[PDB]
């Protein structure tokens, strides 16, 4: 659980870039005139954790004024992906119940990365062909992300 | 042409910004993550200049190399502006006949700026109405905010 965030930008393997567009996280092509959204990742272990998957981290956009979670409301049959007006430096200091929907699992592979949820396992982060959502598989490059540093 | 050029971004008065996409200059909505293409203005001169037409200026895109200019290539319908792989410091000295297509007439209007070509005066540089088009040149318009441009320096 690092006190210092590891800032970076997120790309995918269909040549796109993740930016925050009016409070909504979408993926657009990787043109030069795009200022990628800089995310603030940082480790955060889970007590009753799980194997087979990678390292648990938190996620936050725009320095840290908004964070990622995945809860499944009433609702939309599947889980979803929304933002939260909650500072990131306040998150890792909470317990285990409030940290769970915001915890993701970065499974390292090659130059690629992929974020599996924690509250709803088997549900990853994906792009489409247009906002960013979650998936329970059905493609490949829409899950393998390349993290280029700031 | 004073010492050193001027740097700014071409925001048209329809809330779109000027950026360079795949070697072509387009106009996208000025969004909170769009990196506006920084232009380089060196005020040029034309001994056979036209009255009322503003100060002659040649323009460069993305760190000097690549200047814009109006011409009439093979046998098309109308003139059009393009981009030539040439350094801005190098172009400003070549012959008046060589600089002529690259010179543009900048006539300020308050916080705004007109931009008429020197190779083909009467044709003003312009943007489109739908917000995701390449910036071109026109001689008859249908809105003011597409030739009237803001030059916000950063």
Which residue shows structure tokens 């006949």? B97
For B98: left if phi > 0, alpha if psi spans -120 to 50, otherwise beta; the answer is alpha
Cβ of A33 and B22 within 8 Å? no
Token pair, residue A30, equals 């990787």
Token pair, residue B140, equals 């008859």
Any idea what DSSP says for residue A34?
Answer: B
Least CA distance to B22: which residue of chain A? A31
Alpha helices in chain B (DSSP H): 88-91, 96-99
Distance between CA atoms of residues A1 and B75, nearest Å: 67
Cβ of B33 and A35 within 8 Å? yes
Q: Considering only the C-alpha atoms of chain A, give the largest distance between any 2 of them, rounded to a whole number of Å.
A: 44
B107 C-beta neighbours (distance < 10 Å), count: 14
Q: Which residues pair with A25 in a beta bridge?
A: A20
Distance between CA atoms of residues A98 and A88, nearest Å: 12
Any idea what DSSP says for residue B99?
Answer: H
User: CB burial class (10 A; 0-12, 13-18, 19+) of residue B55?
Assistant: middle
Distance between CA atoms of residues B83 and B21, nearest Å: 13
Contact in structure between B68 and B24 (CB atoms under 8 Å) = no
Which residue shows structure tokens 């003003």? B124
Q: Which is it for strands B55-61 and A16-21: parallel, antiparallel or unpaired?
A: unpaired
Distance between CA atoms of residues A85 and B14, nearest Å: 32
Contact in structure between B94 and B84 (CB atoms under 8 Å) = no
Q: Which residues pair with A69 in a beta bridge?
A: A82
A10 C-beta neighbours (distance < 10 Å), count: 26
Name chain A contacts of B23, Cβ cutoff 8 Å. Answer: none
- C-beta contacts of A62-67 below 8 A and 24+ residues apart: A62/A20, A62/A37, A63/A38, A64/A5, A64/A40, A64/A88, A64/A89, A66/A20, A66/A23, A67/A91, A67/A102
Contact in structure between B149 and B25 (CB atoms under 8 Å) = no
Token pair, residue B36, equals 């506006």
Any idea what DSSP says for residue B68?
Answer: E
Strand ranges across the sheet with A82-84: A60-61, A66-69, A82-84
Q: ∠ at Cα B78 (B72, B84), nearest 5°? A: 35
Cβ of B22 and A35 within 8 Å? no
Distance between CA atoms of residues B31 and A23, nearest Å: 13
For B54: left if phi > 0, alpha if psi spans -120 to 50, otherwise beta; the answer is beta
A87 C-beta neighbours (distance < 10 Å), count: 13
Distance between CA atoms of residues B29 and B11, nearest Å: 9
Cβ of B28 and A32 within 8 Å? no
Q: ∠ at Cα B114 (B111, B115), nearest 5°? A: 135
Distance between CA atoms of residues B52 and B57, nearest Å: 15
Distance between CA atoms of residues A7 and A51, nearest Å: 26
How many contacts does A have with B, using Cβ atoms within 8 A?
26
Cβ of A33 and B31 within 8 Å? no
Half-sphere exposure of A104 (CA within 13 A, CB side): 23
List Cβ neighbours of B26 (8 Å cut-off, separation of 6 or more): B18, B19, B20, B132, B133, B134, B135
B22 C-beta neighbours (distance < 10 Å), count: 7
Distance between CA atoms of residues B152 and A123, nearest Å: 45
- Please, which experimental method was used? X-ray
Distance between CA atoms of residues B86 and B94, nearest Å: 11
- Strand residues in B85-127 grouped as ranges (E): 103-109, 112-117, 124-126
Least CA distance to A31: which residue of chain B? B21
Contact status of B38 with chain A (Cβ, < 8 Å):
no
DSSP A102-150: G-EEE--BTTBB-EEESSSTT-EEE----B-EEE----STTT-BEEEE-
How far away is chain A from the Cα of B89, in angstroms, using its nearest Cα?
Answer: 24
Contact status of B135 with chain A (Cβ, < 8 Å):
no
Kindly list the distances between the CA atom of residue A74 and the CA atoms of A39, A80, A119, in Å, as whole numbers in the listed order: 29, 11, 15
Distance between CA atoms of residues A35 and A53, nearest Å: 31
Contact status of A31 with chain B (Cβ, < 8 Å):
yes
Distance between CA atoms of residues B26 and A58, nearest Å: 37
Handedness of CA A111, A116, A122, A123 (dihedral sign): negative
Q: ∠ at Cα B136 (B82, B109), nearest 5°? A: 115
Three-state SS string over B25-62 comes to: EEEEECCCCECCCCEEEECCCCCCCCCCCCEEEEEEEC
Least CA distance to B18: which residue of chain A? A33
Picking from B36, B39, B1, the residue whose alpha carbon sits closest to that of residue B16 is B36
């Amino acid at each position: 659980k690092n006190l210092n965030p590891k800032k970076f930008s997120i790309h995918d393997q269909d040549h796109k870039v993740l930016v925050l567009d009016s409070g909504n996280l979408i993926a657009v092509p990787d043109k030069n005139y795009i200022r990628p959204e800089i995310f603030f990742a940082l480790a955060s272990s889970l007590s009753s954790a799980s194997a087979e998957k990678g390292s648990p981290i938190l996620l936050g956009v725009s320095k840290g004024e908004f964070c990622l979670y995945c809860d499944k409301d009433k609702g939309q049959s599947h889980p979803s992906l929304q933002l939260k007006k909650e500072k990131l430096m306040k998150l890792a200091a909470q317990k285990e119940s409030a940290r769970r929907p915001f915890i993701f699992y970065r499974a390292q592979v090659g130059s690629w990365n992929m974020l599996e949820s924690a509250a709803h396992p088997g549900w990853f982060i994906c792009t489409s062909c247009e906002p960013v959502g979650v998936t329970d598989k059905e493609n490949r490059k829409h899950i393998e992300f390349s993290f280029q540093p700031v």
